[PDB]
Design an enzyme around this catalytic site. Structure first.
Site, mmCIF file in Angstrom:
data_model
loop_
_atom_site.group_PDB
_atom_site.id
_atom_site.type_symbol
_atom_site.label_atom_id
_atom_site.label_comp_id
_atom_site.label_asym_id
_atom_site.label_seq_id
_atom_site.Cartn_x
_atom_site.Cartn_y
_atom_site.Cartn_z
ATOM 1 N N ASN A 186 24.049 88.313 11.923
ATOM 2 C CA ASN A 186 25.406 87.860 11.552
ATOM 3 C C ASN A 186 25.432 86.413 11.065
ATOM 4 O OD1 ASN A 186 24.910 86.629 13.990
ATOM 5 N ND2 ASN A 186 26.797 87.314 14.960
ATOM 6 N N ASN B 216 34.809 70.748 -1.530
ATOM 7 C CA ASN B 216 35.987 70.013 -1.967
ATOM 8 C C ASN B 216 37.004 70.997 -2.513
ATOM 9 O OD1 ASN B 216 35.180 67.434 -1.249
ATOM 10 N ND2 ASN B 216 34.572 66.801 -3.356
ATOM 11 N N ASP C 215 18.922 86.976 13.357
ATOM 12 C CA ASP C 215 20.238 86.432 13.144
ATOM 13 C C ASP C 215 20.918 87.256 12.068
ATOM 14 O OD1 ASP C 215 22.435 84.828 13.437
ATOM 15 O OD2 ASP C 215 21.670 83.213 12.074
ATOM 16 N N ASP D 226 24.993 83.478 12.071
ATOM 17 C CA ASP D 226 25.828 82.471 12.735
ATOM 18 C C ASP D 226 24.986 81.306 13.297
ATOM 19 O OD1 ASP D 226 24.772 83.718 15.050
ATOM 20 O OD2 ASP D 226 26.708 84.031 15.957
ATOM 21 N N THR E 182 32.477 65.024 -0.544
ATOM 22 C CA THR E 182 33.271 64.055 0.200
ATOM 23 C C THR E 182 34.015 64.637 1.396
ATOM 24 O OG1 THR E 182 33.459 62.685 -1.774
ATOM 25 C CG2 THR E 182 34.949 62.230 0.001
ATOM 26 N N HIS F 279 30.133 57.840 -10.338
ATOM 27 C CA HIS F 279 30.358 59.014 -11.182
ATOM 28 C C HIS F 279 30.379 58.638 -12.651
ATOM 29 C CE1 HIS F 279 31.024 62.303 -8.453
ATOM 30 N NE2 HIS F 279 31.721 61.499 -7.676
ATOM 31 N N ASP G 189 29.278 58.650 3.251
ATOM 32 C CA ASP G 189 29.408 60.082 3.335
ATOM 33 C C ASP G 189 28.235 60.841 2.658
ATOM 34 O OD1 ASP G 189 30.347 59.372 0.784
ATOM 35 O OD2 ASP G 189 32.213 60.527 1.017
#
Ligand SMILES: *[C@@H]1O[C@H](CO)[C@@H](O[C@@H]2O[C@H](CO)[C@@H](O[C@@H]3O[C@H](CO[C@H]4O[C@H](CO)[C@@H](O)[C@H](O[C@H]5O[C@H](CO)[C@@H](O)[C@H](O)[C@@H]5O[C@H]5O[C@H](CO)[C@@H](O)[C@H](O)[C@@H]5O)[C@@H]4O)[C@@H](O)[C@H](O[C@H]4O[C@H](CO)[C@@H](O)[C@H](O)[C@@H]4O[C@H]4O[C@H](CO)[C@@H](O)[C@H](O)[C@@H]4O)[C@@H]3O)[C@H](O)[C@H]2NC(C)=O)[C@H](O)[C@H]1NC(C)=O
Ligand SMILES: CC(C)Oc1cc(C(=O)N2C[C@@H]3[C@H]4CN(C(=O)c5ccc6[nH]nnc6c5)C[C@H]4[C@@H]3C2)nc2cc(C(F)(F)F)ccc12
Ligand SMILES: [Ca+2]
Ligand SMILES: [Ca+2]
Ligand SMILES: [Cl-]
Ligand SMILES: [K+]
Ligand code: NA
Ligand SMILES: [Zn+2]
Length: 806
Positions: A685, A180, A683, A687, A159, A265, A308
């Site tokens: 690192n 979360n 890549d 990022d 969420t 849920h 979401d």
């Protein structure tokens, strides 16, 4: 301390926050234990409910009522949402036919169409079809506006990461809300669902829409609602704010529903108890649209209905316990559930070792329902690594499962039947998007897209310049009637050299050999043409990629392939070739098995050498253009040039050889020819962005040949597969991947078997957007097509997911 003796009189849901110890009346005071004494009485009125009845019509204004049905209520902006329906003979919004909204129809003094974001927690994409009978208001928004079959959330499909991604356009690794639950080791602080630490500004990076708006002079309704404020009140408050004078009225608003997530849920995504939460959300939508209709705003406001993440069936019995794998269970801290994140319980314990934990968790049980990763080895499409709050060790949990540390954690923390958080490609995690209003298109379906793209569009809807974010601005122009964002292509920074023959074979001392000394104006004039680019229109279908950084590189032409060869990294940045449906696969002839050939266009000093590979006992080599797909025995020699060679671990060569020998021709058969661009990615690192040379952590032993962390391919064909890839008149179709270049195949539990049982599964897991490759390589692809640039931006954001139908 808050001295709650002040009053909320005339301040209900005030738009500017007052600082302690003055008492607050904003929609967040409850959450802070800070509301004025009279907040409930004055601001949270419930008397008489939320609907007008026949007998309330024209009543004397009783200020005690939750909403009003008196004559003055329209002017006061506080009628019940069904006022004009009950009392003035009006129809409900849902009962009116769709009519195209060609231009905003706004009251005078509206400078721009307001934007209302209606977000719904846990609203799984298939609810649009499966609950359609009980959601008429939502179905009308969907069918009359612009909708996607689903919208892809970010990982993890939780969420807070997703709502903050919606607000900012950033991946969780960049916005900082990476779950979360989190521990930041620099702050030495913990973020939790329950409590006050989560309110501290230092967690929330980037720049969310309400701040972008504020800074550019656009007023925003406060986005956050305390849980105890009923939905009906939230709706009435938005509608009240919409009645403020011009100078005070916000232009952007958010509504949020805890449903259907809350019930999902408890009951699972399709439990029979789920119908009621969906009816009730629809009723809320109905109240909003009726309320906008009364205010003459229903053909003025842009409404976004957005989720979401979805919801999956998950129960207590489907839990994997780390205690069935690890001896040292008490020396670890696990963030548990639908993902796992592991770190040392104590930083003073030097016996803790991530490598032995990973090994103890790798392919230990036949049907194991999670897979461990060091975070830098997770699929690049998740963009889940570059943040100190993401633990080095990560568990990707299978859909429908949980991971926990010990059984006691489950029964001393079945209750739940649904959960979410799994890999964002999983169908059950997909969510919804509908856009309705004057700025969105009419009755238009658009392809699925990622939620990181919305921030830009919300900025476009409000005339705002977006802060820097991970959307690709222009990729969602096709959602919009107007306010499109018309980007220009980035400027090429480095221009290529076009080397001719400049070196004699004997200048090279590379320790390479080839059995190629076997010998014509017919076939010599011909091969000269091929080295000058004569077949280049066939193999380079969309123009050469542009190099968007400062570097020194060469274009190399050949009969079967073209490459952009980096003199700095000693290998191609990209290799482009087309394979028609009619192409034939051949083998590498026995005499050519270890053949590597100097490239007389490229200096010995800017070449790899075979000795380094001989000396490096761990590293072998592969080729970018595959010798298996050579067009003729003579053309095959080009594939063995030292400038087509790249370093590859033997474990990885198993993956690569199967892709090149088997899968490329399979795709060409299926898609009617394919154009392939492959190359290396560095890549180190993690990022998500191209390394510079000084970031490379590993070289082929004894050399300056840098070792890629990943290999990519971009595989393009005609969307209309009745046209061959090289003669395509319209839209393109693409699938891409970014394969981790690893020294073992520990990721694939079945890798002892034949490549036909495990390689394609691995490739599918590492599916990628062209855009992800662009970030990782500093290249810009599709520079010369007959297609509009916005259509190409959309294509570059496409992810081929390999999930079945939603
Ligand atoms: C997705 O989109 C986003 C947004 O566009 C992309 O992220 C940007 O990438 C840029 C390049 O990496 C990066 O630019 C750097 O910014 C540094 C200053 O940054 C601060 O200010 C900005 C602007 O307000 C702010 O947004 C930043 O916020 C970050 O940090 C705070 C916590 O500190 C967080 O709350 C927030 O969530 C965010 O964190 C994320 O980014 C940081 C990196 O900034 C990560 O560490 C976190 O894990 C997290 O992911 C900052 O508050 C600036 O200092 C950098 O400059 C260095 O490099 C330049 C090269 O131009 C050089 O000129 C300088 O010398 C300097 O080097 C020096 O520092 C080095 C390291 O300390 C050191 O080795 C050297 O020796 C030097 O001393 C740099 O310009 C930008 O910050 C982020 N923005 C965001 C919001 O994350 C992202 O890349 C996209 N992803 C993909 C895959 O495309
Ligand atoms: C977090 C904050 C910075 O951002 C926002 C906060 C809010 C906003 O006001 N809220 C209220 C609720 C907070 C508490 N919470 C939970 O209790 C929760 C919910 C579902 C769960 N499933 N599993 N565990 C869970 C825990 C998550 C947050 C929910 C979002 N609304 C927003 C709406 C938008 C909108 F509408 F624009 F999309 C954008 C951002 C928003
Ligand atoms: Ca949620
Ligand atoms: Ca990098
Ligand atoms: Cl989490
Ligand atoms: K070797
Ligand atoms: Na294996
Ligand atoms: Zn939830």
């Amino acid at each position: 301390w808050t001295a709650t003796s002040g009053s909320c009189k005339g301040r209900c849901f005030e738009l500017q926050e007052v600082g302690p110890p003055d008492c607050r009346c904003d929609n967040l005071c409850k959450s802070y234990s800070s509301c004025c004494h009279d907040f409930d009485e004055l601001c949270l009125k419930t008397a008489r409910g939320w609907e007008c009845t026949k007998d309330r019509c024209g009543e004397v204004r009783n200020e005690e009522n939750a909403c009003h049905c008196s004559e003055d209520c329209l002017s006061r902006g506080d009628c019940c949402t069904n006022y004009q329906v009950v009392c003035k003979g009006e129809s409900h919004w849902v009962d009116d036919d769709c009519e195209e909204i060609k231009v905003p129809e706004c009251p005078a003094g509206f400078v721009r169409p307001p934007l209302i974001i209606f977000s719904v927690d846990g609203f799984r994409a298939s609810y649009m079809k499966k609950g359609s009978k009980v959601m008429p208001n939502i179905e009308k928004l969907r069918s009359c506006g612009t909708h996607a079959p689903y919208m892809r959330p970010v990982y993890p499909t939780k969420t807070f990461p997703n709502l903050y991604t919606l607000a900012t356009g950033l991946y969780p690794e960049s916005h900082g809300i990476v779950g979360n639950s989190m521990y930041d080791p620099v702050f030495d602080a913990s973020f939790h669902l329950r409590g006050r630490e989560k309110f501290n500004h230092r967690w929330w990076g980037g720049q969310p829409l309400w701040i972008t708006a504020t800074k550019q002079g656009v007023r925003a309704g406060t986005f956050f609602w305390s849980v105890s404020i009923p939905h009906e009140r939230r709706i009435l408050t938005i509608l009240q704010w919409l009645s403020l004078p011009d100078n005070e009225r916000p232009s952007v608003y958010a509504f949020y529903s805890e449903q259907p997530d809350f019930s999902g849920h408890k009951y699972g995504p399709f439990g029979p108890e789920m119908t009621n939460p969906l009816r009730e959300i629809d009723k809320t939508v109905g109240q909003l649209m009726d309320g906008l209709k009364q205010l003459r705003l229903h053909r003025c406001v842009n409404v976004i209905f957005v989720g979401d993440h979805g919801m999956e069936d998950v129960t207590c019995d489907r839990t994997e316990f780390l205690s069935n794998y690890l001896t040292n269970v008490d020396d670890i801290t696990l963030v548990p559930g639908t993902l796992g994140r592991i770190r040392a319980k104590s930083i003073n314990n030097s016996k803790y070792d991530p490598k032995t934990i990973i090994a103890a968790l790798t392919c230990k049980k036949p049907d194991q329902h999670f897979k461990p990763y060091m975070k830098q080895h997770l699929p690049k499409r998740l963009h889940y690594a570059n943040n100190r709050r993401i633990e080095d060790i990560h568990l990707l949990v299978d859909r429908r499962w949980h991971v926990a540390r010990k059984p006691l954690d489950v029964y001393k923390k079945c209750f739940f039947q649904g959960d979410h958080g799994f890999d964002n490609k999983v169908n059950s995690m997909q969510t919804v998007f509908v856009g309705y209003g004057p700025t969105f298109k009419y009755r238009t379906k658009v392809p699925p897209f990622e939620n990181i793209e919305l921030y830009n569009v919300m900025c476009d809807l409000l005339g705002l310049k977006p802060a820097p974010n991970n959307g690709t601005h222009g990729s969602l122009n096709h959602l919009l009637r107007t306010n499109t964002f018309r980007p220009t292509m980035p400027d090429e920074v480095s221009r290529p050299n076009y080397p001719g023959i400049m070196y004699l074979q004997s200048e090279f001392d590379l320790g390479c050999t080839c059995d190629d000394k076997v010998e014509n104006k017919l076939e010599e004039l011909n091969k000269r043409l091929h080295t000058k680019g004569s077949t280049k229109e066939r193999h380079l279908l969309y123009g050469r990629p542009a190099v968007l950084y400062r570097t020194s590189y060469d274009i190399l032409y050949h009969t079967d392939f073209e490459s952009g060869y980096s003199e700095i990294f000693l290998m191609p940045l990209w290799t482009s070739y087309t394979i028609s449906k009619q192409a034939e696969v051949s083998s590498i002839p026995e005499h050519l098995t270890n053949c590597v050939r100097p490239d007389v266009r490229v200096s010995p000093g800017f070449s790899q050498n075979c000795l380094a590979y001989k000396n490096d006992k761990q590293m072998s080599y592969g080729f970018l253009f595959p010798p298996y797909l050579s067009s003729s025995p003579e053309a095959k020699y080009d594939a063995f040039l030292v400038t087509n060679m790249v370093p590859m671990y033997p474990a990885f060569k198993r993956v690569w050889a199967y892709f090149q020998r088997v899968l490329v021709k399979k795709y060409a058969s299926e898609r009617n020819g394919v154009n392939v661009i492959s190359g290396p990615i560095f890549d180190y690192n993690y990022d998500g962005l191209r390394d510079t040379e000084d970031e490379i952590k590993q070289y082929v032993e004894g050399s300056s040949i840098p070792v890629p962390t990943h290999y990519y391919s971009i595989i393009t064909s005609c969307l209309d597969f009745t046209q061959p890839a090289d003669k395509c008149d319209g839209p393109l179709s693409v699938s891409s991947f970014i394969l981790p270049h690893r020294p073992d195949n520990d990721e694939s539990c079945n890798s002892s078997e034949d490549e036909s049982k495990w390689v394609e599964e691995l490739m599918k897991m590492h599916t990628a957007r062209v855009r992800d490759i662009e970030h990782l390589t500093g290249l810009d692809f599709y520079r010369k097509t007959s297609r509009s640039y916005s259509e190409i931006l959309t294509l570059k954001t496409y992810l081929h997911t390999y999930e079945s139908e939603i």
